[PDB]
Amino acid sequence: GITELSRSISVDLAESKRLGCLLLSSFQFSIQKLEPFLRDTKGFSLESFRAKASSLSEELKHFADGLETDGTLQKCFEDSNG
Amino acid sequence: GPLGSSATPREDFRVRCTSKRAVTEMLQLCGRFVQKLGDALPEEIREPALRDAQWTFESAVQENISINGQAWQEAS
């Protein structure tokens, strides 16, 4: 069901890269479940929502690249704890 | 090299994570992009829709990772 998201991300990729991909797929997933409940009331066109949502998806992809190089994503795979 | 049996091909496609807290902090950072959707949302449904979108976003990530081979809700 919802586990299709990680099943659809190549396992030939490093696991930290797969986490970055999973972040974007989850963002797009939550977009797509919200969109059918939006209608063209004045001041809020679905066209403008898709423009804002797709613009944010590309900013998120850049943001995740930054988290991949500054070590933040890598912390999800480290343990020096009990 | 030849010693031992070989591992069977991968069957668990969830991202194999080790730190539940680090994932939570990553989700907090990415949560800012969900909030930015509120601009395009109408005031009528904005607040409940953003809570719903945030929870859907965090659920999709959490259900697609393992914490030390365990499910998210059963790990620490």
Numbering used by the authors:
A (entry chain D): 116 to 197
B (entry chain E): 24 to 99
From the paper:
Kinetochores, multisubunit protein assemblies, connect chromosomes to spindle microtubules to promote chromosome segregation. The 10-subunit KMN assembly (comprising KNL1, MIS12, and NDC80 complexes, designated KNL1C, MIS12C, and NDC80C) binds microtubules and regulates mitotic checkpoint function through NDC80C and KNL1C, respectively. The 10-subunit KMN assembly consists of three complexes, the 4-subunit MIS12 complex (MIS12C), the 2-subunit KNL1 complex (KNL1C), and the 4-subunit NDC80 complex (NDC80C) (Bharadwaj et al., 2004, Cheeseman et al., 2004, De Wulf et al., 2003, Desai et al., 2003, Kline et al., 2006, McCleland et al., 2003, Nekrasov et al., 2003, Obuse et al., 2004, Pinsky et al., 2003, Westermann et al., 2003, Wigge and Kilmartin, 2001). Human MIS12C (also known as MIND complex or Mtw1 complex in Saccharomyces cerevisiae) contains the MIS12, PMF1, NSL1, and DSN1 subunits (synonyms are reported in Table S1A). Finally, MIS12C is a binding hub that connects the other two KMN complexes to CCAN through an interaction with CENP-C (Gascoigne et al., 2011, Hori et al., 2013, Hornung et al., 2011, Hornung et al., 2014, Liu et al., 2016, Maskell et al., 2010, Petrovic et al., 2010, Przewloka et al., 2011, Screpanti et al., 2011).
In addition, we report the crystal structure of the isolated Head2 domain determined at 2.0 Å. The buried surface areas (Collaborative Computational Project, Number 4, 1994) for the MIS12:PMF1 and DSN1:NSL1 pairs (4,209 and 3,575 Å2) are much larger than those of the four other interfaces, which range between 465 and 1,905 Å2. Both subcomplexes start with N-terminal helical hairpins that interact in four-helix bundles (defined here as “Head1” and “Head2” domains for the MIS12:PMF1 and DSN1:NSL1 subcomplexes, respectively) and progress into a “stalk” region. The helical connector joins Head2 to the stalk, but Head2 itself is less restrained, as its linkage to the helical connector is extended and apparently flexible. We speculated that the detachment of Head2 from the core of the MIS12C might, at least in part, explain our difficulties in obtaining well-ordered crystals of MIS12C. Thus, Head1 is necessary, but not sufficient, for high-affinity binding of MIS12C to CENP-C. As expected, we saw no binding of Head2 to CENP-C. Thus, Head2 and the segments that precede it (also deleted in the MIS12CΔHead2 construct) are not required for CENP-C binding.
